[PDB]
Amino acid sequence: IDEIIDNSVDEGIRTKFKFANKINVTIKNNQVTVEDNGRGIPQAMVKTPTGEEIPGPVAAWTIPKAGGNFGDDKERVTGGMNGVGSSLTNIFSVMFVGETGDGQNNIVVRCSNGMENKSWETIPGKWKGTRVTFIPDFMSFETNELSQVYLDITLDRLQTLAVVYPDIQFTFNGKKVQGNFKKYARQYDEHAIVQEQENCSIAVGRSPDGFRQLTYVNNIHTKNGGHHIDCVMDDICEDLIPQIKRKFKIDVTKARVKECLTIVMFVRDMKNMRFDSQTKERLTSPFGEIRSHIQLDAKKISRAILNNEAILMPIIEAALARKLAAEKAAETKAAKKASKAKVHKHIKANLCGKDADTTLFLTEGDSAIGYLIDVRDKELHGGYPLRGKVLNSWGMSYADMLKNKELF
């Protein structure tokens, strides 16, 4: 589905937001109807190296290595580099119909039985757009029907791409979606710091159970990212990690610094994009072109998440959980200082240990032990005072009776 969706988006972006601005998506019960009001593929003749004369939309939809995206890399803003995409969509579909009106004619291509049947026809009409309605091949994929988790994926992707491009209005099954970076940042975390430019929009949030990201190069969901997030995160961290080192004198490592963020980065209007696969999941463009194109102030993001203790102080308290927790002193602010085993206050008789009829007086204060020293028998009667006020006895653990001084 994403091939036809990005074909409609590329038709939108090749005319600078003036056609294909209304893309309607309808995927219910194994049938997909996706339309836009673009120019579409025109009626102009595109030649084949074999010599046969095949018209425009049918060569775009059935034969691979065909497209208008094979131009110069210094001018192209679209993400397409293959020519094989709508053929890849059409090959794995058991039913397909596709209409492209160019303002003078409709070109309708019907395909079936896995490129055993394909037929293009030209109808007179006044339409100007593209609509693809296909029922996919379930004998090739490991499925039989369509489930709602894919529709949740499609709805969230349309939400995301509407946040990327607000000029193009997308409707999923007749339901409109608006796109704002603030609501998309605040669906993520309530304290996600936003930073927007004329070509960039980056929000920084939190990732408590690992690391999270969702970055976009132009109109492709780069789930593996690319060189752009590497350069931007190096530019943020090269101001952030010395700032937290000046802040709380903890040299947090770069993985440990960047491991507690979720990043919402949407980049628009870039040139000379390079991805290393037909999967297109990660950018292998050189960093000089990306650094020349990006004019995002990453130091603004560094100062805007440095003062934000909703993100940074979890990293610093995890550092406290591994370094200040290692800074062990083990007190409770009761009296502090040295943890003495036995204090010097002690009265010991000579029968300290043997079996006799001796006694110990647990009397109160130095007065009563002064009178007791002036009174007692040295062999028979002992004594010990108490240092002061003792609290409730059974509110405290047996190791905390061991922590108490006079009880020890």
Partner 1 sequence: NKGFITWDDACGEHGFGFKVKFRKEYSLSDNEEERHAKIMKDFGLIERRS
* 61 binding partner (options its own copies, partner 1, ligand ANP, none; Cβ < 5 to 8 Å by kind): ligand ANP
Task: Kindly state the smallest distance separating residue 307's Cβ from its own copies, in Å.
Answer: 22
DSSP string spanning 301-355?
HHHHHHS-TTTHHHHHHHHIIIIITTS-----SSS-S---SS-S-----TTSSSS
Amino acid type, 254 = K
Task: Kindly state the smallest distance separating residue 355's Cβ from partner 1, in Å.
Answer: 20
* 66 binding partner (options partner 1, ligand ANP, its own copies, none; Cβ < 5 to 8 Å by kind): ligand ANP
Task: Kindly state the smallest distance separating residue 349's Cβ from partner 1, in Å.
Answer: 8
Please select the residue that binds its own copies; options are 278, 295, 307, 350, rule is CB under 8 A.
278
Q: Crossing angle, helix 298-306 and helix 227-248, to 10 degrees?
A: 40
Question: Can you point out the beta strands (E) in 68-218?
Answer: 93-102, 105-112, 117-124, 128-136, 169-172, 175-176, 193-196, 200-204, 212-217
Q: Does 338 bind its own copies (CB under 8 A)?
A: no
Residues 6+ apart with CB under 8 A from 31: 95, 133, 134, 135
Region for 226 from its dihedrals, namely left if φ exceeds 0, alpha if ψ lies in -120 to 50, beta otherwise: left
Q: Which DSSP symbol is given to 83?
A: S
* 330 binding partner (options its own copies, partner 1, ligand ANP, none; Cβ < 5 to 8 Å by kind): its own copies
CB 130 within 8 A of CB 40: yes
Taking residues 185 to 214 in sequence order and writing x for each that binds its own copies by CB under 8 A, - otherwise, the string is: ------------------------xxx---
Q: Does 245 bind partner 1 (CB under 8 A)?
A: no
Whether residue 6 is annotated as binding a ligand: the answer is: yes
Please select the residue that binds partner 1; options are 143, 178, 278, 350, rule is CB under 8 A.
350
Please select the residue that binds its own copies; options are 329, 338, 341, 352, rule is CB under 8 A.
329
Whether residue 3 is annotated as binding a ligand: the answer is: yes
| Site for ligand ANP, rule CB under 6 A | 3-4, 6-7, 11, 41, 60-61, 66-69, 79-86, 130, 280
Task: Kindly state the smallest distance separating residue 39's Cβ from ligand ANP, in Å.
Answer: 9
> Which C-beta is closer to ligand ANP: that of 118 or that of 291?
118
> Which C-beta is closer to its own copies: that of 59 or that of 229?
229
Main-chain phi, psi angles of 175, to 5 degrees: -115, 120
Of 151, 132, 49, residue with least CA distance to 88: 132
> What residues line the site for partner 1 (CB under 8 A)?
347-348, 350
Binding positions for Mg(2+) are 3, 6
